[PDB]
């Protein structure tokens, strides 16, 4: 009963069967079908041999279209006649044309409204796109309906940016430039998005809050809810997503200013004029949204399975991923959920033969991830005291695939060594690498930008269920999946993301026919959990944090150094940060020596120092105006929730600082953030010093 | 080498010698004399045998009078002639008339100013005193100088209350009613305050922040400071303290309205008219303050001594008390500091014979307590991650005596059983109780109001160095000292509090000639530290928390039930709180069974559950507008920093609720606080459940 025993028990065929099982009907959060799947998973995890498996339910704000009053967009003429209407549903895929309860495309949490106005095209609606529009092109979005292409950043950031530009509505669409790979066919004949395809998704800006109505506290039976006007993160303008057939109709008539350059042009046979409004002949026509979706407090269900530790039952290693999907969830999340299911089954076989892991393993099937990480966050709010005193590590388990080229790992530096070592012991599933390790294929296909002979591992960003564990609670976290070639990655995900076309057949036919990439991902995620839950000494290397902290300090310093005059005027020094990083490096080196040179108390003392090291980067005061982003080293980018930002407090203080009215106040805040960062790094270092 | 060995080594004669040694010159925070005493203590603790003894220094905002521009108050006539001036200094006591660097009486952190106006007498300047003035008597304090008698509540609350009433200055004075015990002589012939005596003290409203310029972060070398206008807790009107000879001169001419009743009248031969202003003949005379004190960032020094644990070096039991005094500190703090010194010496003797405690003991000599708990708080801010993961308990050690009648203990419920047991094993020092236990004399003289055969133990309030450890960080905390008869206690402290007359001779002559009360307090504080640092199982009884939580829930419910109509209208239920308390009671009972029915891992797991139980009552979001008061069960009263309030969030939401303009919003907030309290109690209970 070792890791090899665990790993060998995992079967590609089982993952395939589970994926099929999980993807036959929609499992939208808050629906009966998803409660039924929750009860199924609970039953099976009990069968598989877990010690206890419970449902943890919460009543959270969700959002749904009105079934008898559909959402749509129009071009409207002078007289008020609707001369063009966008589609009410995606054409259903072959053999699903009679499946009921497919939620039509909508933007979750949009307010209701019927705004009419002139269109402005805002490219990807990124911060720099709005800078270009308002500063360089002098185009004013106030009272306009903005049309933006999906991609590059989380859609909630697009909506926030449009809102602050004064837009009265937002139309999101999938451009073939971003969601149609050259030379591959549209679904069902390949993996591309057809013109009638539409990406669902929420447009919240929760900043880690969880349920919009109950920030800080679980949405239990006696919870006291904020009123809707005080809710966290809701958009104040109507928003709706469309496909590129419909987008072409909205864009083809656009007049006003030309696109500023080619990076604003997608692939449609359209000028990509910015507007505002339409060309001469159509100048009196307007665009009208009709949004009637409702926000509703709705019950959600997490499945929580426990495999009690033999030696340290009060130490938790958590494998969690969500179960709710937009429609069938063929990739997102069921390709991940099937992998978790097989991992539970494998751990359970070992358990039935009398084995127990050293530490407690918790398994989670989260609900309502798609509506803002609501299930994971409410559960973590409920159990925060247990998690922060006992939480060793969190491994996420959403989609196992976003491509089929190579491995993707995003994790805390504390897990780098664990990942390098585990992947050296796993077989590559890649063509041309048969008989070679996963480590070998991965570093060959995804080389580190910094170190020869090492693979790329990214910072954790957000937009998934690790956010509460990592950035709020400071529990060492990681994720892994298969991905496309980093070199050709345009960072907008796979074409059928959150569409009705994301089905079992998509995966079985076009991504992973042999389920070998799924199996590899099961081995990586399960192998990580195994090592974290069983290794005598926690498998974290604090020295890996020391290396990246120096890299991040250099990076933030370099950003500041674009403003040498201001750094002189306001006496802005990074000396304290570099000093703290140097100290961390020295103390981490000494701690590592003791860790090899040392008695269960010294061990556990040692293990507690390892466990609480991620915890030490938490600031209980949070980051400015983002109280649930407490980690001082890593936060989701204020411009793109999906992206991780390092030294986020200093980064945001420096961002666009040349445009601040009061430079004294602005640079004062840069200095304050340097102080907080230097202090936190030093304090974290000191947790690794001898204890007395 | 057991507790008896430790206890027997403690000597009354040593405490006496140390008290004498610590009280010959003033030790004002931020002065050279107090840095010298810090270096002395450091040297002696090294000599006594501690493993390491370091100084931890910080640069914090302090406040001092201007030596060449003295503070004083005048009665000023029509022409602007100053016809009466208050005293510039307290007449120095016999044999100290040539001692230099006695800081004259002042209110630390007063702003500068010379306001002139009419006097209003506001009794003790409590919330209910201002309610009486403004609501019942229709007296408007706006633009008036208020005169208030010291006593009943922390002076900072008086100043806040006066400020919000619109006062333009505050004069604080010691009334003989509150600071002259009938039948005892004035210093030097007894322990009473003479008419020229004046009580120093800060008038901040920090609410746990520590250094006004650096809330959240230690005031280290690279700290970034708030500007003075954004500092925490500074008063916005000038304030000055005077003695009763001077107060009589200010009060004797007061006209306007009569005192509303006898509870407004002190003991001076004066009408206690409320004003505003003076009687007919003197109606054109005014009162003028002249305050020229300056706030200055100044270095302070804590002494931190470590005695490393043999078995759990990463578990800290902290004995801390301050060293800085207003003048000689004969009682406050040196009667406590001498006790700590002797405790260190006794632990050190044992250590030199080869003993070590099971857990690490930390000893602290804090600086700048008198200026707002600044030394303890900055150190805890620096070391917060170590303290919250490793902090077992904090025992405070300020003044060992406020009387000589019986024991006073204020502590967390987790220490009740420890205290009852320890005091049963100690000898009573009381006359008439020779050969009896301290427990016996204490419960006879200070009976519990609730339980026959038990002594009174109060809730922790604040106004001392345990505040950061208990209410911010959630470390189990306690204090103990000798006190006066509870039955005759008027709750304003001893007459010579913070006066020049608080000397070695005061204690040696009038409080504790034989130093037997000091020795008893050394045995209580040291005995507590010993048990906490050495007992195999931490000496906390979680069931004692269950009992008080029910008491507090009944109390808060009863307050709400004065508003039955509103509880009906707004559906205000305490059911969830009572449910959580019931659950806590049940789980605590089961945990206690396992604690006796159980392996060092199960033990330590068990010990961690005990250690983290106080920690579980912390809410990282803090209480409303008081982010550093995080404990949900106990906070300092919003009306009196010295007093502990239970369920403070709900208490403040209910306070004066009948006067709120918007009852819907007000009762909504009561419900929100009930939710937070019920959740926190349940979450704390669940930390005592089986871990997996
Ligand atoms: C990285 O780790 C190193 C430790 O190796 C830390 O070094 C400390 O750095 C600060 C400087 O920022 C030093 O602070 C200075 O302390 C002097 C007194 O120190 C005595 O006491 C301590 C223990 O209390 C002993 O360790 C020490 O050896 C001495 O016995 C003060 O006199 C200094 O203040 C004077 O100079 C400054 C600067 O010019 C003026 O602003 C002041 O007004 C004053 O005149 C100063 O405060 C500290 O001594 C160093 N410690 C050690 C052990 O060397 C780094 O701080 C750490 N980096 C971070 C970011 O934490
Ligand atoms: C003190 O400790 C007790 C445990 O002994 C807690 O009791 C829980 O109390 C809540 C009620 O507030 C119960 O919640 C209810 O759960 C039902 C489903 O429960 C099932 O699943 C759980 C595990 O997930 C099992 O433990 C349980 O036995 C069941 O199998 C829901 O159906 C209920 O909702 C319905 O009724 C309410 C109220 O009328 C409506 O508002 C809803 O719309 C809905 O129709 C309800 O949510 C919970 O089951 C109890 N747990 C147990 C183990 O008994 C107390 O909560 C605790 N006190 C505090 C303050 O925490
Ligand atoms: C675009 O859609 C609008 C609105 O139509 C409604 O919503 C759609 C998304 C679908 O769900 C439709 O089934 C649904 O009707 C169309 O305009 C609408 O046309 C209808 C029928 O022509 C109008 O109905 C009325 O009927 C009676 C007479 O029988 C009279 O009271 C009225 O005079 C009117 O004729 C309806 O008013 C009108 N609604 C709006 C808001 O304009 C529109 O035709 C369509 N455009 C296309 C297909 O190009
Ligand atoms: C109350 O105190 C005031 C102020 O006196 C000053 O502050 C005190 C607390 C002590 O530190 C004093 O030593 C200090 O002077 C007294 O009023 C002041 O009186 C003096 C002397 O009479 C005035 O000095 C001036 O001197 C020259 C002439 O030699 C001329 O320029 C002026 O015409 C004036 O006479 C001083 O102006 C005056 N100050 C104020 C603010 O009023 C006051 O007498 C005293 N009251 C008592 C003892 O009842
Ligand atoms: C996905 O897999 C699950 C688990 O295999 C399937 O659910 C299972 O379905 C079977 C057959 O429908 C159920 O067995 C039946 O039980 C009832 C008594 O409760 C009895 O009347 C029948 O004779 C039959 O034995 C079984 O309860 C159920 N198991 C669980 C744990 O839910 C499910 O059908 C699969 N879904 C798809 C879409 O393929
Ligand atoms: C990933 O694998 C590497 C390579 O096995 C691990 O590093 C190795 O860890 C071992 C065990 O602690 C080290 O052995 C030690 O060697 C020193 C002498 O150099 C000796 O004093 C100790 O008694 C012990 O035997 C070994 O040096 C070390 N190798 C390297 C190259 O660092 C690493 O720990 C693994 N990472 C994780 C997270 O498990
Ligand atoms: C309070 O007690 C302390 C500790 O006993 C006293 O401080 C100590 O004073 C002695 C005598 O003044 C010092 O010894 C001297 O040392 C110097 C060399 O440094 C030498 O020239 C002298 O011959 C003498 O031996 C001693 O250093 C000092 N100890 C410490 C730890 O500070 C202090 O005097 C007492 N204070 C009062 C007010 O009674
Ligand atoms: C304060 O002192 C009291 C009285 O000594 C302590 O309570 C006592 O603690 C002992 C040791 O855990 C208990 O003994 C146990 O008895 C049960 C059977 O009743 C047995 O199963 C266990 O093996 C064990 O021998 C004893 O019952 C208990 N007495 C009472 C009256 O509760 C208390 O723990 C002390 N408090 C602290 C904080 O140390
Ligand atoms: C979904 O849409 C329909 C409208 O097509 C809503 O039903 C109407 O609601 C209004 C306002 O409450 C009533 O005055 C009408 O009597 C209803 N009209 C019809 C034709 O039924 C319905 O409320 C919406 N559903 C939700 C959940 O908001
Ligand atoms: C203490 O008080 C004296 C005044 O009696 C202050 O000294 C004066 O300061 C002002 C304003 O800065 C100067 O214009 C004068 O030249 C000074 N006058 C005298 C008579 O010396 C002194 O600054 C105060 N000290 C502090 C620390 O504030
Ligand atoms: C944009 O338009 C609105 C409303 O017409 C106006 O109030 C606002 O100031 C404009 N902004 C700029 C930068 O021109
Ligand atoms: C899956 O792998 C093949 C290589 O055999 C590749 O050509 C194909 O495009 C991949 N599928 C996806 C969806 O990327
Ligand atoms: C008290 O006096 C001030 C200034 O004279 C006035 O503005 C204020 O409204 C008064 N308050 C009451 C309650 O009379
Ligand atoms: C100290 O004890 C005696 C009893 O012997 C008492 O009369 C005296 O008032 C006490 N001193 C103080 C300061 O309370
Ligand atoms: Ca919540
Ligand atoms: Ca501070
Ligand atoms: Cl993932
Ligand atoms: Cl005390
Ligand atoms: Zn998704
Ligand atoms: Zn997902
Ligand atoms: Zn004091
Ligand atoms: Zn004190």
Sheet holding B476-483, edge to edge: B52-64, B294-307, B359-366, B312-322, B391-396, B476-483, B406-411
CA distances (Å), origin B469, targets A107, B318, B332 = 47, 10, 20
Question: A683 vs B382: CB contact, 8 Å cut-off?
Answer: yes
The tokens describing B1, both together, are 């080498």
Phi/psi for B241 (5° steps) reads -100, 145
A607-616 exposure pattern, b = at least 16 Cβ within 10 A, e = fewer: bbbbbbbbbb
Question: B692 vs A384: CB contact, 8 Å cut-off?
Answer: no
Please return the burial class of A450, using the count of CB atoms within 10 Å of its CB with bins 0-12, 13-18 and 19+: exposed
Nearby residues of A452 by Cβ (< 8 Å), 6 or more positions away: none
Residues A71, A75, A78, A79, Cα dihedral to 10°? -50
Sheet holding B286-290, edge to edge: B82-85, B72-76, B286-290, B116-117
CB A264 within 8 A of CB A272: yes
Output the CA torsion sign for A105, A111, A113, A115: negative
Distance between CA atoms of residues B190 and B509, nearest Å? 8
What residues of chain B lie within 8 A of the CB of A220, using their CB?
Answer: 679
Nearby residues of B294 by Cβ (< 8 Å), 6 or more positions away: B63, B64, B66, B112
What residues of chain B lie within 8 A of the CB of A605, using their CB?
Answer: 312-314
Distance between CA atoms of residues A508 and A492, nearest Å? 22
Distance between CA atoms of residues A16 and A38, nearest Å? 19
Distance between CA atoms of residues A411 and A419, nearest Å? 9
Nearby residues of A528 by Cβ (< 8 Å), 6 or more positions away: A393, A395, A415, A418, A419, A422, A478, A480
The enclosing H or E element of A290 equals: strand A286-290
The tokens describing B545, both together, are 């928390």
Q: What is the resolution of this structure in A?
A: 1.6
Among the listed residues A129, A175, A211, A369, the single catalytic one is A369
Q: Up-side HSE of residue A114: CA atoms within 13 Å toward CB?
A: 9
CB A403 within 8 A of CB A494: yes
Q: How far is CA A174 from the centre of its chain?
A: 19
User: Of B417, B467, B498, B403, which is closest to residue B636 (Cα–Cα)?
Assistant: B467
The tokens describing B229, both together, are 């206008």
Distance between CA atoms of residues A647 and A199, nearest Å? 32
A639 is in an annotated binding site: no
User: Of A457, A435, A430, which is closest to residue A446 (Cα–Cα)?
Assistant: A457
Would you say the CB of residue A590 lies under 6 angstroms from ligand 9?
A: no
User: Of A513, A522, A505, which is closest to residue A426 (Cα–Cα)?
Assistant: A522
**What CATH fold (topology level) applies to the domain A540-692?**
Transcription Elongation Factor S-II; Chain A (1.20.930)
Phi/psi for B292 (5° steps) reads -130, 10
Residues of chain B with CATH 1.20.930.40: 540-692
A 493-532 → B contacts, CB under 8 A: none
CB A303 within 8 A of CB A397: no
Distance between CA atoms of residues A333 and A18, nearest Å? 12
The tokens describing A295, both together, are 């926000």
Count, in order, helices (H) and strands (E) of chain A: 21, 19
Would you say the CB of residue B203 lies under 6 angstroms from ligand 8?
A: no
**What CATH fold (topology level) applies to the domain A66-291?**
Glucose Oxidase; domain 1 (3.50.30)
Please return the burial class of B280, using the count of CB atoms within 10 Å of its CB with bins 0-12, 13-18 and 19+: exposed
Distance between CA atoms of residues B542 and B545, nearest Å? 5
SS3 per residue for B264-288: HCCCCCCCCCCECCECHHHCCCEEE
Q: How far is CA A399 from the centre of its chain?
A: 11
B463 is in an annotated binding site: yes
CB A18 within 8 A of CB A321: no
User: Of A114, A120, A115, A118, which is closest to residue A146 (Cα–Cα)?
Assistant: A120
Distance between CA atoms of residues B476 and B611, nearest Å? 8
CB B456 within 8 A of CB B381: no
The tokens describing A335, both together, are 């390709």
CB B181 within 8 A of CB B494: no
Distance between CA atoms of residues A617 and A682, nearest Å? 10
**CA diameter of chain A:** 85
Q: Which of A120, A130, A135, A142 maximizes ligand 11 atoms within 8 Å of its Cβ, making it the mutation to test the pocket?
A: A142
User: Of B37, B19, B24, B195, which is closest to residue B95 (Cα–Cα)?
Assistant: B24
User: Of B607, B175, B170, B159, which is closest to residue B358 (Cα–Cα)?
Assistant: B607
For residue B247, list its beta bridge partners. Answer: none
Euclidean distance between the first and the last CA atom of chain A, given in angstroms as a whole number: 38
Helix B32-48 with B334-352: angle, nearest 10 deg: 30
Residues of chain A with CATH 3.40.630.10: 1-65+292-539
Question: B386 vs A620: CB contact, 8 Å cut-off?
Answer: no
Catalytic residue set of B: 369, 573, 608, 631
For residue B149, list its beta bridge partners. Answer: B173
Tokens 């006696």 belong to residue: A222
Q: Up-side HSE of residue A104: CA atoms within 13 Å toward CB?
A: 17
CA distances (Å), origin A163, targets A138, A145, A205 = 17, 10, 12
**From start to end of B446-539, where are the E strands?**
476-483
Residue B95: Cβ within 10 Å count: 10
Distance between CA atoms of residues B610 and A325, nearest Å? 41
CB A387 within 8 A of CB A450: no
Let me know if A608 is a catalytic residue: yes
B299 is in an annotated binding site: no
CB B175 within 8 A of CB B250: no
The tokens describing A36, both together, are 């039924």
Q: Which of A222, A581, A667 to mutate to test the interface with B (most CBs of B within 10 A)?
A: A222
**From start to end of A188-278, where are the E strands?**
201-202, 239-242
State which ligand 7 atom lies nearest to the alpha carbon of B43. Answer: 31
SS3 per residue for B282-340: HCCCEEEEEECCEEEEEEEEEEEEEECCCCEEEEEEEEEEECCCCCCCCCCCHHHHHHH
Tokens 């040539």 belong to residue: B98
Let me know if A290 is a catalytic residue: no
What residues of chain B lie within 8 A of the CB of A311, using their CB?
Answer: 601
The tokens describing B233, both together, are 């807790």
Q: Up-side HSE of residue A589: CA atoms within 13 Å toward CB?
A: 7
CB A321 within 8 A of CB A477: no
The tokens describing A48, both together, are 């598989």
In 3-state terms chain A splits into helix, strand, coil percentages (rounded to 5) of 40, 20, 40
DSSP state of B668: H
Distance between CA atoms of residues A532 and A528, nearest Å? 6
Residue minimizing CA distance to atom 31 of ligand 7 = B40
SS3 A636: strand
The tokens describing A596, both together, are 């090899």
Put simply, whether A249 touches B (Cβ < 8 Å) is no
Q: How far is CA B125 from the centre of its chain?
A: 19
> How far is ligand 1, taken at its centre, from the CA of residue A673, in Å?
21
Among the listed residues A631, A637, A638, A669, the single catalytic one is A631
CB B394 within 8 A of CB B476: yes
For residue A316, list its beta bridge partners. Answer: A360, A391
Distance between CA atoms of residues B519 and A294, nearest Å? 71
The tokens describing B505, both together, are 């001779």
A636-673 exposure pattern, b = at least 16 Cβ within 10 A, e = fewer: bbbbbbbbbbbbbbbbbbbbebeeeeeeeebbbbbbbb
The tokens describing A378, both together, are 């409410």
Distance between CA atoms of residues B681 and B619, nearest Å? 11
SS3 B344: helix
User: Of B486, B338, B519, which is closest to residue B406 (Cα–Cα)?
Assistant: B486
Domain A1-65+292-539 listed as CATH 3.40.630.10: yes
Distance between CA atoms of residues A159 and A170, nearest Å? 7
Would you say the CB of residue B418 lies under 6 angstroms from ligand 8?
A: yes
User: Of A433, A393, A625, A499, which is closest to residue A90 (Cα–Cα)?
Assistant: A499
Please return the burial class of A318, using the count of CB atoms within 10 Å of its CB with bins 0-12, 13-18 and 19+: buried
Give the chain B residue nearest A688 (alpha carbons): B386
SS3 per residue for B139-200: CCCCCCEEEEECECECHHHHHHHHHHCCCCEEEEECCHHHHCCCCCCECCCCCECCCCCCCC
Distance between CA atoms of residues A372 and A370, nearest Å? 6
Give the chain B residue nearest A311 (alpha carbons): B601
Ligand nearest to the CA of A37: 5
Put simply, whether B567 touches A (Cβ < 8 Å) is no
SS3 B204: coil
DSSP A488-556: G--SS--TTTTSTT-SHHHIIIII-TT-HHHHHHHHHHHHHHHHHHH-SS-S--HHHHHHHHHHHHHHH
Let me know if A656 is a catalytic residue: no
CB B83 within 8 A of CB B285: yes
Phi/psi for B491 (5° steps) reads 65, 50
Distance between CA atoms of residues B139 and A166, nearest Å? 50
For residue A408, list its beta bridge partners. Answer: A481
CB A376 within 8 A of CB A369: yes
Q: Which of B412, B542, B596 maximizes ligand 8 atoms within 8 Å of its Cβ, making it the mutation to test the pocket?
A: B596
CA distances (Å), origin B310, targets B268, B314, B356 = 60, 10, 6
B641 is in an annotated binding site: yes
CB B154 within 8 A of CB B641: yes
What is the least distance, in Å, from the CA of A389 to any CA of chain B? 8
Put simply, whether B576 touches A (Cβ < 8 Å) is yes
Put simply, whether A671 touches B (Cβ < 8 Å) is yes
Distance between CA atoms of residues B39 and B650, nearest Å? 46
Distance between CA atoms of residues B394 and B529, nearest Å? 9
Give the chain B residue nearest A608 (alpha carbons): B389
Give the chain A residue nearest B573 (alpha carbons): A222
Distance between CA atoms of residues A152 and A264, nearest Å? 13
A473-486 exposure pattern, b = at least 16 Cβ within 10 A, e = fewer: bbbbbbbbbbbbeb
> How far is ligand 13, taken at its centre, from the CA of residue B142, in Å?
6
Integer-rounded Cα Rg, in Å, for chain B is 25
Output the CA torsion sign for A341, A343, A346, A350: negative
Ligand nearest to the CA of B108: 21
What is the least distance, in Å, from the CA of A314 to any CA of chain B? 5
Distance between CA atoms of residues B325 and B497, nearest Å? 11
DSSP A474-492: --EEEEEEEE--GGG--SS
Output the CA torsion sign for A349, A354, A355, A360: positive
Please return the burial class of A339, using the count of CB atoms within 10 Å of its CB with bins 0-12, 13-18 and 19+: buried
What residues of chain B lie within 8 A of the CB of A678, using their CB?
Answer: 222
Phi/psi for A479 (5° steps) reads -145, 155
User: Of B416, B442, B417, which is closest to residue B427 (Cα–Cα)?
Assistant: B442
User: Of B147, B95, B94, B87, which is closest to residue B121 (Cα–Cα)?
Assistant: B147
A265 is in an annotated binding site: no
Residues of chain A with CATH 3.50.30.30: 66-291
Question: A692 vs B217: CB contact, 8 Å cut-off?
Answer: no
DSSP state of B256: B
Distance between CA atoms of residues B211 and B202, nearest Å? 13
CB A304 within 8 A of CB A363: yes
């Amino acid at each position: 009963h070792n890791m090899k025993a665990f790993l060998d028990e995992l079967k590609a065929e089982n993952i395939k069967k589970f994926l099929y099982n999980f993807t036959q009907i929609p499992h939208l959060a808050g629906t009966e079908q998803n409660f039924q799947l929750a009860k199924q998973i609970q039953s099976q995890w009990k069968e598989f041999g877990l010690d206890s498996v419970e449902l943890a339910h919460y009543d959270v704000l969700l959002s749904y279209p009105n079934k008898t009053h559909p959402n749509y967009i129009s071009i409207i003429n002078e007289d008020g006649n609707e001369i063009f209407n966008t589609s009410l549903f995606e054409p259903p895929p072959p053999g699903y044309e009679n499946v009921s309860d497919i939620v039509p495309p909508f933007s979750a949490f949009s307010p209701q409204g019927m705004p009419e106005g002139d269109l402005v095209y805002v490219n990807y609606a990124r911060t720099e796109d709005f800078f270009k529009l308002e500063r360089d092109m002098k185009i004013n979005c106030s009272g306009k309906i903005v049309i933006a292409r999906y991609g590059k950043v989380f859609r909630g950031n697009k909506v926030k940016n449009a809102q602050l530009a004064g837009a009265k509505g937002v139309i999101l669409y999938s451009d073939p430039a971003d969601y149609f790979a050259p030379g591959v066919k549209s679904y069902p004949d390949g993996w591309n998005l057809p013109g009638g395809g539409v990406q669902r998704g929420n447009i919240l800006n929760l900043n880690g809050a969880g349920d919009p109505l109950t920030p800080g506290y679980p949405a239990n039976e006696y919870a006291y809810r904020r009123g809707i006007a005080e809710a966290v993160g809701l958009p104040s303008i109507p928003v709706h997503p469309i496909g590129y057939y419909d987008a072409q109709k909205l864009l083809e008539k656009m007049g006003g200013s030309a696109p500023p350059d080619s990076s604003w042009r997608g692939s449609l046979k359209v000028p990509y004029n910015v507007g505002p409004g339409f060309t001469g002949n159509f100048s009196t026509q307007k665009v009208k949204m009709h949004i009637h979706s409702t926000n509703e407090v709705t019950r959600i269900y997490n499945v929580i399975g426990t495999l009690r530790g033999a030696v340290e039952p009060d130490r938790y290693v958590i494998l969690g991923g969500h179960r709710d999907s937009w429609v069938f969830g063929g990739i997102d999340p069921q390709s991940g959920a099937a992998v978790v299911h097989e991992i539970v089954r494998s751990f359970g076989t070992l358990k039935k033969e009398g084995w127990r892991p050293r530490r407690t393993i918790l398994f989670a099937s989260w609900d309502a991830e798609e509506f803002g990480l609501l299930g994971s966050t409410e559960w973590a709010e409920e159990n925060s005291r247990l998690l922060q005193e006992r939480g060793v590590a969190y491994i996420n388990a959403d989609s196992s695939i976003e491509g089929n080229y190579t491995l993707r790992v995003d994790c805390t530096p504390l897990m780098y060594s664990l990942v390098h070592n585990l992947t050296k012991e796993l077989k590559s599933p890649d063509e041309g690498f048969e008989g070679k390790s996963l480590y070998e294929s991965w570093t060959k296909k995804s080389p580190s930008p910094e170190f020869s002979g090492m693979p790329r591992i990214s910072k954790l960003g957000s937009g998934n269920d690790f956010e509460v564990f990592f950035q709020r609670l400071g529990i060492a976290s990681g994720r892994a999946r298969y991905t496309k070639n980093w070199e050709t990655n345009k960072f907008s995900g796979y074409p059928l993301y959150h569409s009705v076309y994301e089905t079992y057949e998509l995966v079985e036919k076009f991504y992973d026919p042999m389920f070998k990439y799924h199996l590899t991902v099961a081995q990586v995620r399960g192998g990580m959990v195994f090592e974290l839950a069983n290794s005598i000494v926690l498998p974290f290397d604090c020295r890996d944090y020391a290396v990246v902290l120096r890299k991040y300090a250099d990076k933030i310093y370099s950003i500041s150094m674009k403003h040498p005059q201001e750094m002189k005027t306001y006496s802005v020094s990074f000396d304290s940060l570099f000093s703290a990083v140097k100290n961390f490096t020295e103390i981490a080196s000494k701690f590592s020596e003791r860790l090899q040179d040392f008695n269960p108390i010294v061990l556990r003392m040692m293990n507690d120092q390892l466990m609480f090291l991620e915890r030490a980067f938490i600031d209980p005061l949070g980051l400015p105006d983002r109280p649930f982003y407490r980690h001082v080293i890593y936060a989701p980018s204020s411009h793109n929730k999906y992206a991780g930002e390092s030294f986020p407090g200093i980064y945001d203080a420096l961002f666009d600082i040349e445009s601040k009215v009061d430079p004294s106040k602005a640079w004062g805040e840069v200095k304050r953030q340097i102080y907080v960062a230097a202090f936190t790094v030093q304090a974290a270092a000191e947790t690794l010093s001898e204890v007395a």
